[PDB]
Amino acid sequence: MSKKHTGYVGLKNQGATCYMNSLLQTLFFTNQLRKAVYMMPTEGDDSSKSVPLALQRVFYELQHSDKPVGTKKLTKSFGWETLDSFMQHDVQELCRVLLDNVENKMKGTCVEGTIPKLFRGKMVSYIQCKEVDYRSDRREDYYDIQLSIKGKKNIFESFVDYVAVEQLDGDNKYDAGEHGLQEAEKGVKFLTLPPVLHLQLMRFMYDPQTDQNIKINDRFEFPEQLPLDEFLQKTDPKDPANYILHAVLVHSGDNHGGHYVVYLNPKGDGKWCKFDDDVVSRCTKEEAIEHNYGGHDDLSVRHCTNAYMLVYIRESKLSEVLQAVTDHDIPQQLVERLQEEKRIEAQKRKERQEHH
Numbered sequence: 035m036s037k038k039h040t041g042y043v044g045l046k047n048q049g050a051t052c053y054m055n056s057l058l059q060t061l062f063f064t065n066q067l068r069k070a071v072y073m074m075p076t077e078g079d080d081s082s083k084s085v086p087l088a089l090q091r092v093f094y095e096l097q098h099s100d101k102p103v104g105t106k107k108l109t110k111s112f113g114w115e116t117l118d119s120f121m122q123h124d125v126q127e128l129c130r131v132l133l134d135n136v137e138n139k140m141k142g143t144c145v146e147g148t149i150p151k152l153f154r155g156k157m158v159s160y161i162q163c164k165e166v167d168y169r170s171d172r173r174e175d176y177y178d179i180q181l182s183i184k185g186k187k188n189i190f191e192s193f194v195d196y197v198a199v200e201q202l203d204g205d206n207k208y209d210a211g212e213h214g215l216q217e218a219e220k221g222v223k224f225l226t227l228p229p230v231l232h233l234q235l236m237r238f239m240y241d242p243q244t245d246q247n248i249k250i251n252d253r254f255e256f257p258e259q260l261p262l263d264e265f266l267q268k269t270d271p272k273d274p275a276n277y278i279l280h281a282v283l284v285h286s287g288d289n290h291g292g293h294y295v296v297y298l299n300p301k302g303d304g305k306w307c308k309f310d311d312d313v314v315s316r317c318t319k320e321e322a323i324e325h326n327y328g329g330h331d332d333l334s335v336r337h338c339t340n341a342y343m344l345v346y347i348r349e350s351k352l353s354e355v356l357q358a359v360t361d362h363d364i365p366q367q368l369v370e371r372l373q374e375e376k377r378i379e380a381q382k383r384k385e386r387q388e389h390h
């Protein structure tokens with residue numbers, strides 16, 4: 035079926051997990067992550083409690099299964115077992131849960147630090163007083179960036195807006211402590227950009243006049259090749275911040291009952307597939323990229339299919355982030371534990387039908 039068409043298998047549609055399946059594929063094809071994950075020492079773990087073991091299972095099955103892969107034990111493991119869990123959280127929050135879990139499980143192993151190595155960048159947020167000599171600098175790690183979309187035509191304009199200087203004057207002067215209220219400038223600077231760049235687009239904005247979040251379907255364009263050197267405080271001549279589009283997570287509709295899919299070119303070679311739960315299919319570059327720009331603001335239709343998250347990988351890191359994964363990257367002990375796991379579930383299904 036879809037494994038035979040594309041080389042890639044899908045994930046089952048099992049309840050309403052919204053953006054989850056999209057995110058799981060995204061992470062699975064972050065090959066360096068997937069390798070580290072197989073290396074976690076989950077020997078002792080409980081399969082319905084351990085996010086690390088449950089993820090190993092999902093990735094292993096994605097790598098070896100010919101049929102669509104289930105996620106029930108994974109959702110049970112991090113406790114998001116209803117629509118409501120998914121409705122209470124942004125996509126990046128789920129991603130943070132998965133990454134934190136596996137990062138913690140890599141402590142004291144041969145693969146410790148993989149998660150910050152791949153996903154962590156450095157920024158500094160500042161408030162500079164204009165008339166007095168005072169500055170507050172807050173250095174922060176980030177694993178993702180939330181880009182403003184409203185009134186922005188493209189990623190370049192969002193980044194421009196992201197690093198824009200805000201004037202704190204008049205009615206909103208800065209409380210400068212013992213200097214009293216002071217005229218000031220506020221901004222954020224990027225010190226580094228991580229090898230794997232996760233960008234969420236801010237389409238689900240609070241609306242005062244309906245007192246709810248509403249999805250903004252406006253046009254927002256993102257390129258295949260993304261140069262970010264100009265947003266770095268200090269550029270690097272031997273490692274320019276040139277990024278290549280890896281994944282486009284897409285939503286259709288106006289609510290969490292809409293359709294979620296993800297487009298990926300897993301090898302970073304511009305050859306794209308559409309991942310729609312159990313159906314993986316080849317698609318054009320144009321289907322993956324421009325057709326998810328949205329807008330088209332055309333009267334007969336409501337056009338509400340568009341990108342909400344993008345994954346870019348730094349050109350200089352691409353061959354290493356998307357380093358290939360072979361049978362040798364899956365420890366035998368893990369393979370045995372996962373077969374043991376498939377047998378125990380094959381027995382729980384037989385015991386469940388007998389009682390009914």
Ligand SMILES: C[C@H](CC(=O)N1CCC(O)(Cn2cnc3c(Br)csc3c2=O)CC1)c1ccccc1
Nearest residue numbers: 124125180234235236237238249285288289290342
């Ligand atoms: C209705 C549906 C809900 C949903 O699944 N998502 C909630 C929003 C989502 O987290 C993207 N996203 C992430 N951080 C933010 C922030 Br912070 C402000 S708005 C914002 C946003 O929009 C993706 C998952 C949706 C889908 C796509 C775009 C807009 C709405």
